[PDB]
Design a protein around this ligand. Structure first.
Ligand code: DGT
Ligand code: MN
Ligand code: MN
Ligand code: MN
Length: 430
DNA sequence: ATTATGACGCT
DNA sequence: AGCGTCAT
């Protein structure tokens, strides 16, 4: 009752750029705009691997992790842009630099947590309080929410998309308690006004469109963001959670799309998020551990406490390349040459990071995969990173891995390596 | 031959 | 520290 918490203390948004790498290439090359198009890495094997897909191309069934040749079977007029290749490997610098453009704009409105190259959480609680105090009580016009959906509305007692969106928004606004500066629904609504402004600024100043979710925590904001893509934002209120979760497959919630989610389904004999409410907190902890159990108990009621961390820069700067099938590395000269290539890209990126961001990495993590190993990484070892020098970094990586060569011959490398990965970590201010 | 990342939890 | 999971 009056003491049972409802997880409505914050306003959190998740902003995700639509088909980002595609939008970056479409900005650069206007011939690709408003077309079925995709971004690919490499080209020789099956046309290259697709990693991003415009919504026009998605309508034909084109997806990520599809070979370009197969995509062309679904969509013969598909247009393709290729990721840059430098030092023999894919180089993602163009997309990282575009990401910094967007993140710097977002940071003008609130402190952000960079969750990926293309998405960031926003803690809007304080900005909402500000705008409400500037809002001397007058209601929020629908004109301030021109791209907002209210999940679950319209309901109760026109056959167009935009008409439905507007009906739901009008039902929502009509029911608003605009006189109460502590009303969570009002706070979410003002958060959505701010996110409209942030998304408008991103598009005006970069050309890029995005989607967003507004709710009371990170998981609901992420889920909300996915409900109406592209170029739209969705408000998920606390009150919308019972209906939303009653038909929500457990795997759709962030962190439950893998083995843990499958075990929730198999152990409890349930399918949907809402079914979790019938278990006690102790029951869930008994199956899934104390941390997971408390998290699930709260999450299935719409409640989650993970903070938006004030972190707009990545914590690690890494370089990796797979050597699949017959391209696996089988000589010492080969291994050394590719370690050097990776280390030279790493040096370039680290030196730019030090100039931009006033910090230096201090640990080098070296990871490899050996042929026939099912795991992504067969081995991970760390060593000291004391100098931003590619030859030193590659020599050190070779020293940390050289005992994995089981070949008696010092010239050959066996079993051959199917992955190399260098990662700079443990930053200190400088 | 589903690639190049990046974050975080466990012990 | 080194490994596993999750995201995509
Ligand atoms: N190199 C590489 N990049 C990836 C991979 N998966 C995704 N990316 C990149 C390309 C995408 O444009 C970008 C953002 O990922 P998202 O899941 O947010 O999808 P995207 O923005 O493409 O589409 P959407 O958000 O659904 O509109 O990340 C991958 O496996 N390898
Ligand atoms: Mn995206
Ligand atoms: Mn994303
Ligand atoms: Mn995607």
């Amino acid at each position: 009752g009056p003491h049972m918490a409802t997880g409505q203390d914050r306003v959190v948004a998740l902003v995700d750029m639509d088909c980002f790498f595609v939008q970056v290439e479409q900005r650069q090359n206007p011939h690709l705009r408003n077309k079925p198009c995709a971004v690919v890495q490499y080209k020789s094997w099956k046309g290259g691997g697709i990693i991003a897909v415009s919504y026009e191309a998605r309508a034909f069934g084109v997806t990520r992790s599809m070979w370009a040749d197969d995509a062309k079977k679904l969509c013969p007029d598909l247009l393709l842009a290729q990721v840059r290749e430098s030092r023999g490997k894919a180089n993602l610098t163009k997309y990282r630099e575009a990401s910094v453009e967007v993140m710097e704009i977002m940071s003008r409105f609130a402190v952000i947590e960079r969750a990926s190259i293309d998405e960031a959480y926003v803690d809007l609680t304080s900005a909402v309080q500000e705008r409400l105090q500037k809002l001397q009580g007058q209601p929020i016009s629908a004109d301030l929410l021109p791209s907002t959906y209210i999940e679950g509305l319209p309901q109760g007692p026109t056959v167009q998309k935009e008409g439905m969106r507007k009906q739901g928004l009008f039902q929502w606004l009509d029911s608003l308690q605009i006189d109460n500066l502590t009303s969570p629904d009002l706070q979410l609504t003002v958060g959505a006004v701010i996110v409209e402004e942030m998304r408008a600024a991103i598009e005006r100043e970069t050309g890029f469109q995005c989607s967003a979710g507004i709710s009371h925590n990170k998981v609901l904001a992420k889920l909300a963001c996915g409900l109406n893509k592209p170029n739209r934002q969705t408000l998920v209120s606390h009150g919308s959670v019972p209906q939303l979760f009653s038909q929500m497959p457990i795997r759709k919630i962030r962190s439950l799309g893998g083995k843990l989610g499958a075990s929730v389904i198999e152990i409890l004999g349930i399918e949907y998020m809402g079914e979790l409410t019938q278990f006690t907190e102790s029951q869930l902890q008994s199956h899934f551990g104390e941390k997971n159990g408390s998290w699930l108990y709260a999450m299935c009621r719409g409640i989650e406490h993970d903070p938006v961390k004030p972190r707009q820069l990545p914590k690690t700067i890494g370089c990796s390349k797979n050597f699949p099938g017959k391209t696996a590395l089988a000589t010492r000269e080969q291994v050394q040459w590719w370690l050097l290539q990776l280390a030279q890209e790493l040096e370039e990126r680290l030196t730019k990071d030090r100039n931009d961001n006033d910090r230096v990495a201090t640990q080098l993590v070296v990871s490899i995969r050996v042929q026939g190993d099912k795991r992504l990484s067969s081995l991970r070892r760390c060593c000291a990173l004391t100098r931003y020098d590619a030859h030193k970094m590659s020599h050190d990586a070779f020293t940390v891995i050289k005992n994995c060569n089981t070949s008696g011959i010092q010239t050959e490398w066996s079993p051959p390596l199917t992955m190399l990965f260098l990662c700079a970590t443990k930053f200190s201010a400088s």
